[PDB]
Amino acid sequence: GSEFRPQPLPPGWERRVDDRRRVYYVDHNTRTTTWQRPTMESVRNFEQWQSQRNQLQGAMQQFNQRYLYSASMLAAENDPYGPLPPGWEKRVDSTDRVYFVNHNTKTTQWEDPREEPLPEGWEIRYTREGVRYFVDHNTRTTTFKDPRNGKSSVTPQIAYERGFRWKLAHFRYLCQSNALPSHVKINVSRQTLFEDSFQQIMALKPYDLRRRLYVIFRGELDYGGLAREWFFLLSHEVLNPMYCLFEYAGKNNYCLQINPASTINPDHLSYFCFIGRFIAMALFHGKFIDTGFSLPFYKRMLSKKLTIKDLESIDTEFYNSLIWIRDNNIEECGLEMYFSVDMEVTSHDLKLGGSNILVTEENKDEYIGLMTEWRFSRGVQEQTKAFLDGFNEVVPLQWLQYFDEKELEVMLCGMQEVDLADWQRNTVYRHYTRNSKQIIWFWQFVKETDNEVRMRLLQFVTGTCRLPLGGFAELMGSNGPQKFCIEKVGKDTWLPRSHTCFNRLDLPPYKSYEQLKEKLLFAIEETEGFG
């Protein structure tokens, strides 16, 4: 009774057997090739992709304006004594270091950081008056007690800021301290970049990817921009449907994820390794990519734990399914769930012997536990390991230790200047009008702040630092087009929530600009979790 009712092959497509009797398919049209039986559906994804990855001619021009980040040596002082207190600059003369305190116009020959380098993870800072304090990125705390001398100054202590500049300058250094000499030659044709890039990288030992990068495109320059270019194109190139590597959670190109069916491709692990070494290489040589993984993917890289609000980002209908079971009686409601999942079709047991354990109130929380874990890692575990190991042999993941996921995404992706007019014209208000005090204040906040907090605000709401390609008018959600939207919720004692799939900032009606600036800034900086 209907053993096979699939689609026929679209004309211009031949099924084949290879030298070992696997089955592959050949788009006679595009003169291309895939392991995965085509539907007339998936071709329009490929067409949705060929349109992306052909029209990206001018995506390049913006993506180089993107090379705003941190004027590397021009703005990265990881001096081991640490910084000069405010108003102090360092100087030299007869090859002898003098110190000027512009704060006072005196001049010492003694460095004011009085000799004993401080432990892994700690940063010295000073204050608008001058007092030295200490920032502990191993716990995101700030005591006044020096880690070495147990010492201090009377106390009235300080709130934690993240120090990205400093966490980055320590990364840059770690990368250049392990860089090898000579160069590694990457030779690719534009028509075959990928197949090409894959084979080369995957034939090198990992250390060689740490030599200088000499990329050249057969038939065409500056070595630097070609490296920018290579990473740009190749980042879009692994996204290509015919390879079966990644799918997407929501419609269009929303919420990129490892496809669990990539196993139809018998080399998929070697590609996740390849893709893995590729992202590491981009970081290690200070080049951006543009593939855009989801924030809970970066969290697995940091090996932080995947909470239930990360689940809201990647499958909004599955997360509502779990919240409902969590906040309502399920003996009251007539369904019959067990500790297993049907997903290709095979029943996998969240727990030992799950498939014959009824989900009762007694254990519905343990169910929601396992359910969340499974959702994040259904069928893509090797794929993930493959990628992480591929990454790890080129940049050891431990070098990422003091980064949160929303920093790890600015290090890969870029950091463009946000167009403030385009943002506010293409913003929609639920339970506000453009004359609402919280809304006027919100854009005063946005004009008044700086670009790094604008990026984090955007990461907090939409889930990504990448502004979409066609203005904020084309910003996308999990159900397709979904403009940035600010919505009045609760009273002034609440905290801002975010709904990443609908690009919705839930913004309580605060009684002042000062309270709003505060309550909000805290929310966009807050990262839960530890790795």
Numbering used by the authors: 3 to 116, 123 to 163, 167 to 231, 234 to 357, 362 to 548
What do the authors say?
However, we were able to solve and refine structures for the apo-proteins which were improvements on previously published data. The available crystal structures for WWP1 (PDB ID: 6J1X20) and WWP2 (PDB ID: 5TJ819) have missing domains and/or high Rfree values. The WWP1-2L34H crystal structure was solved at a resolution of 3.17 Å in the previously unreported space group C2 with two molecules in the asymmetric unit. Interestingly, this is the most complete structure of WWP1 solved to date revealing a structured WW2 domain. The grid boxes to perform the docking simulations were generated in cavities on the HECT domain surrounding the active site cysteines 890 (WWP1) and 838 (WWP2) given the ability of NSC-217913 to interfere with ubiquitination. The ligand poses of compound 11 in both WWP1-2L34H and WWP2-LH are somewhat similar due to the similarities of the proposed binding site between these two enzymes. These poses show the imidazo[4,5-b]pyrazine moiety engaging in π-π interactions with the phenolic side chain of Tyr639WWP1-2L34H and Tyr587WWP2-LH alongside the Cys640WWP1-2L34H and Cys588WWP2-LH backbone amides participating in hydrogen bonding interactions with the imidazole nitrogen. However, the ethyl butyrate thioether chain interactions differ significantly between the two enzymes, most likely associated with the residue mutation at M865/I813. When docked against WWP1-2L34H, the side chain of 11 orients itself so as to interact with the guanidium ion of Arg855, orientating compound 11 in closer contact with Tyr639, allowing π-π interactions with both rings of the imidazo[4,5-b]pyrazine core. As the heterocycle is oriented very similarly in the predicted complexes with both WWP1-2L34H and WWP2-LH, it may be that the increased π-π interactions and ion-dipole interactions between the ester and guanidinium functionalities of 11 docked to WWP1-2L34H provide the additional strength of binding observed in the IC50 values.
